[PDB]
């Protein structure tokens, strides 16, 4: 029933744009896009087409009832000009889970991956090769039922667009607002899926953080103020735990955590090293407060595709500014992660995580 | 800064559609309202032929759900006068929604007049059979062509219209499973935002699979009854203190403040015949009240279906008969009678806004 890469239709652009000569994340797009339509006849043939507007019926359920989901992954170009995607199978898996949660049509993950490979191959010259640059890949699946009844759509659109990017200077630390009034996601909810509806409501919360002199939001959960995420990034703490053991901890996948690809990759790398405990456990502000008083915290940071690994130096909680000594500790773990990831992403070391285009 | 109705651009259709049993939200009228917002502020509002939207693939409406909507009804009286039901409350709510998603503010009375003009142009689409109306669907979306999660510098406000029939005293069954969560305290379930709806589609499919028609949304360790489908919930009973009462859950974060809900509270409070309260309702209380024969009627309220009775609730594996229909339903019938008198201009009333 899935659309097939074997049926890919291609229309080259006749309005090719000049590439960037200052890359602002997510604002510059390449010449082509993928588009696939689904209706009562199933999936149509996939097509690579020139970058262009979507035409939607004004009642489209994508716009009224948020039948929408997305992905985000990067492709990187090595010195030899070979382009490789970073662990894209995980994004495909996550995308399909999102689709099922929103009653959107199923597709074949490898068929989509091949279509995306073909699209990036067409726009290969858009993938920059300067240090710290990449191509951001944005798949999207939206419902497209022209009806105001809240219902499973009988029509949908799957499309993929591409953006050359730089950093989002990838080792500049940030300050976080930690206010329990704002709740990103709830157990039994959809916070662990990459659905559009999870993001729009955060915009005002981010504005409030800025107003309070902070740069990003630390999302707290539950009566014990668990640290869940930071902005649109997973949170990690490298510390000596209350039992005396040095560990890297991140919250477990209990429903309010988006299971990041970078997150998983950091756990995977640190487990492979075998040099300290690597654990998924709830982290509370009580534990962090005590650990900071007792000098046991080394580094705190967010993980995610767009910004990679970002250090945190301050947390504002219950009107008090908590200094986080991440930069004082190197930040050694952060720098090590960034170096090993860069070697893999740009092909300095062969690795099964990279998917060649 | 707001767009002004005085600046309205009118483009009449050259291809009118053939007019219509009306199925909710699937038939559209000939025209729509469109207004764009960008760095220069609001453009001039426009009434134009119903037509597709053209959106940049990076539009923040489609990636980060920078989208909200409204729903309200216009009614045509016997003499063809068309009137909107309490539209000021929808404009108020729409603006609260806009602020919550960092979308641009607009002047509520300017939008109302633009909407009046649109309905006037499409006045012949407003049906006048008993139980029929015109459903008005305003929408505001962010339209920033950027993958950054940020306040948009572009937005689009549009309004489409649907003639509708019934949706009106046929009772429904509800699935009440605490696994399902519509909204949480500290969330945005109390705003009419697109994001609150998409996740419910799968849950509604589970309700159907279990032989029920709609979802009774439970919340909290005490299994509070919050909402029913996309409708507010009311219970008419004799409470544990022996007092006859109409109760609906309070606006404490997980309840969408319905216009019909407020109207029912206003109406019953004005009668002064029984106690009318906003208080949480738990399954424990309902189970006990059912066993003691204290429950008279349970129903949902909302624009598309008005007031709908409930006759059954499946609470996990236990099937509960709700005696609404054996009790008249006297309250539901009275509310429906009085609202009809007001909506269709039988009785002049400040709740109605003439077109
Ligand atoms: C939703 C995926 C695309 C995307 C949008 C966006 O706005 N951001 N912002 C990010 N990082 C901001 C940030 C910096 C430091 C900390 Cl500790 C937390 C958040 C990311 C990423 N990655 C991202 N992605
Ligand atoms: C979200 C606004 C438009 C809209 C869509 C939709 O699907 N519905 N469904 C409704 N009612 C179903 C229902 C019937 C009985 C009970 Cl007890 C609960 C829900 C309504 C309405 N009103 C509506 N509106
Ligand atoms: C996308 C996302 C992440 C993790 O992203 P990866 O790029 O898969 O590592 C974490 N949290 C939130 C809220 C996200 O949207
Ligand atoms: C719109 C809405 C209501 C109330 O609707 P009114 O038509 O304003 O009475 C109640 N609950 C939910 C979930 C809604 O979307
Ligand atoms: Cl992998
Ligand atoms: Cl998960
Ligand atoms: Cl009013
Ligand atoms: Cl409210």
UniProtKB/Swiss-Prot annotation, chain B:
What are the protein's UniProt keywords? Answer: Acetylation, Amino-acid biosynthesis, Aminotransferase, Branched-chain amino acid biosynthesis, Disease variant, Lipid metabolism, Mitochondrion, Pyridoxal phosphate, Transferase, Transit peptide
Mark the residues carrying the PTM N6-acetyllysine: 284
Instruction: Please cite one Gene Ontology biological process associated with this protein.
Output: lipid metabolic process
Which residues are connected by disulfide bridges in this protein?
A: none
The protein's GO terms of the molecular function aspect are: branched-chain-amino-acid transaminase activity; L-isoleucine-2-oxoglutarate transaminase activity; L-leucine-2-oxoglutarate transaminase activity; L-valine-2-oxoglutarate transaminase activity
What InterPro entries does the record point to?
A: Aminotrans_IV, Aminotrans_IV_CS, Aminotransferase-like, B_amino_transII, BCAT-like_C, BCAT-like_N, BCAT_family
Q: Which positions does the record annotate as the modified residue N6-(pyridoxal phosphate)lysine?
A: 192
Q: Which SUPFAM superfamilies match?
A: D-aminoacid aminotransferase-like PLP-dependent enzymes
Tissue-by-tissue expression: Ubiquitous.
Q: Does the keyword Amino-acid biosynthesis apply?
A: yes
Record's disease association: Hypervalinemia and hyperleucine-isoleucinemia: An autosomal recessive metabolic disorder characterized by highly elevated plasma concentrations of valine and leucine/isoleucine. Affected individuals suffer from headache and mild memory impairment.
> What does the UniProt record say this protein does?
Catalyzes the first reaction in the catabolism of the essential branched chain amino acids leucine, isoleucine, and valine. May also function as a transporter of branched chain alpha-keto acids.
Among NCBIfam families, the record links this protein to: ilvE_II (TIGR01123), PRK13357.1 (NF009897)
Protein name (database record):
Branched-chain-amino-acid aminotransferase, mitochondrial
